[PDB]
Curated annotation (Swiss-Prot):
Keywords assigned by UniProt, alphabetized: Aspartyl protease, Disulfide bond, Hydrolase, Protease, Signal, Zymogen
Protein's UniProt keywords contain Signal: yes
Protein EC: 3.4.23.22
Catalytic residue list: D35, S199
Catalytic activities: Hydrolysis of proteins with specificity similar to that of pepsin A, prefers hydrophobic residues at P1 and P1', but does not cleave 14-Ala-|-Leu-15 in the B chain of insulin or Z-Glu-Tyr. Clots milk
Any one Gene Ontology molecular-function term assigned to this protein's record: aspartic-type endopeptidase activity
A Gene Ontology BP annotation from the UniProt entry: proteolysis
Family to which the UniProt record says this protein belongs: Belongs to the peptidase A1 family.
Residues of the full protein shown: 90 to 419 of 419
Limits of the Peptidase A1 domain: 17-328
Protein name: Endothiapepsin
EC class of the enzyme, as a word: hydrolase
Disulfide bonds, paired cysteine numbers: C255-C290
């Protein structure tokens, strides 16, 4: 089997991407944030504290003839950005782009933090990291990909995120028309439960490539590119007027600037992030100070190849017995 679903930016800045997911019988379609940095499929639901729902579409398990309460199971998750959610668990039928999993753990939110409430466009998350990170207790549950894997034509999924435009998540096949040149594959460590890999270095604009190992995670659920302070300083040094602002919470730059590209290495291959991808717009409405898309990972504890990086590539998440990651230009 295979599946193919379009993923759409939630706003004009590509702050996140939503992908429609069918849950239950008859189908209830929710727009979920596909997140290769976590491993829980959770949704706003009829059980979510009413004051914490503000415009989201909810899953109502009582209206699904295939929903079953997973007795005694609870979940609770905290994300790197400080947000959180928790609740109980159903199993139900879940389909993404024509690919169907029966008995998928669907984690129903009883509580969500303010940032989720305040984002009306995201109805929940669909985790695509390794199932070892799943938070369901006392019986850990499998991700949608893990459940689908054996049935897929090939045990892979691909992320093809757009810049200011829709893109695609495919399951079970590699669309050879979706990228240019070749896909370069690179080793993955699953030891922290992430799609963790080591970039071979970077360049700023038309500058020379610096060969240096940068361990980080391919994370579709993180907006920006978080890299070591040395790398980030080197980038922003090429933008007149750019500075790190403690009050804003990162590097900012004059909105009048033309940003240089940023290149990262994948083995001997190179992925180029155009400068415009690194512009996240005014820090507040009407400001001429703009927020940077490349930020320091110092104090996160891990480097994160988030959407800013991933959207410059066609990315293969290869879930073979020994997982690997593939990157191609597009």
């Amino acid at each position: 089997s295979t599946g193919s679903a379009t993923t759409t930016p939630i706003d004009s800045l590509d702050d996140a991407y939503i992908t429609p997911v069918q849950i239950g019988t008859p189908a209830q379609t929710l727009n979920l944030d596909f997140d290769t940095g976590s491993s829980d499929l959770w949704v706003f639901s009829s059980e979510t504290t009413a004051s914490e729902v503000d415009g989201q579409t909810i899953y109502t398990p009582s209206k699904s003839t295939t929903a079953k309460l997973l007795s005694g199971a609870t979940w609770s998750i905290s994300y790197g950005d400080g947000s959180s959610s928790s609740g109980d668990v159903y199993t139900d039928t879940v389909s993404v782009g024509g690919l169907t999993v029966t008995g998928q753990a669907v984690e129903s939110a009883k509580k969500v933090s303010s940032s989720f409430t305040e984002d009306s466009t995201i109805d929940g998350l669909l985790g695509l990291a390794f199932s070892t990170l799943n938070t369901v207790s006392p019986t850990q549950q499998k991700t949608f990909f893990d459940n689908a894997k054996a049935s897929l034509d090939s045990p892979v999924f691909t992320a093809d995120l757009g810049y200011h435009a829709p893109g695609t998540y495919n399951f079970g096949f590699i669309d050879t028309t979706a990228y240019t040149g070749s896909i370069t594959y690179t080793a993955v460590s699953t030891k922290q439960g992430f799609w963790e890999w080591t970039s071979t270095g970077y360049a700023v604009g038309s500058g020379t490539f610096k060969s240096t190992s940068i361990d980080g995670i391919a994370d579709t659920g993180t907006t920006l590119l978080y890299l070591p302070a040395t790398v980030v300083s080197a980038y922003w040094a090429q933008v007149s007027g750019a500075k790190s602002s403690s009050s804003v919470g990162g590097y900012v730059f004059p909105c009048s600037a033309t940003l240089p590209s940023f290149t990262f290495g994948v083995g001997s291959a190179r992925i180029v992030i155009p400068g415009d991808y690194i512009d996240f717009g005014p820090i507040s409405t009407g400001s001429s100070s703009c927020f940077g898309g490349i930020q320091s990972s110092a104090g996160i504890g891990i480097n994160i190849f988030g959407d800013v990086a991933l959207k410059a590539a066609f990315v293969v998440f290869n879930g073979a017995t020994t997982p690997t990651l593939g990157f191609a230009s597009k």
